[PDB]
């Protein structure tokens, strides 16, 4: 469906947020919050740092 890649490394400092690395691209990424998004890592659902990530075409 939708793919997204991160720019740099970040640590999800939340309860429902996951971390990802630039070399680690995830799928199923949507925008729930005007400032935050959602990321899926091989089934692992969580939050995607809109400031440290980007939605791929």
């Amino acid at each position: 469906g939708i793919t997204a890649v991160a720019l740099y490394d970040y640590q999800a400092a939340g309860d429902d947020e996951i971390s990802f690395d630039p070399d680690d691209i995830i799928t199923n990424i949507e925008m729930i919050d005007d400032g935050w998004w959602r990321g899926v890592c091989k089934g692992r659902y969580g939050l995607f740092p809109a400031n440290y990530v980007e939605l791929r075409q």
């Binding site: 720019l7 970040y10 400032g35 809109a50 400031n51």
Partner: peptide, 19 residues
Amino acid sequence: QRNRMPPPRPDVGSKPDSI
């Protein structure tokens, strides 16, 4: 040098106001 480090990134620690 024709190479410089990228500027500082915006606050990412922020969190939504409502789920």
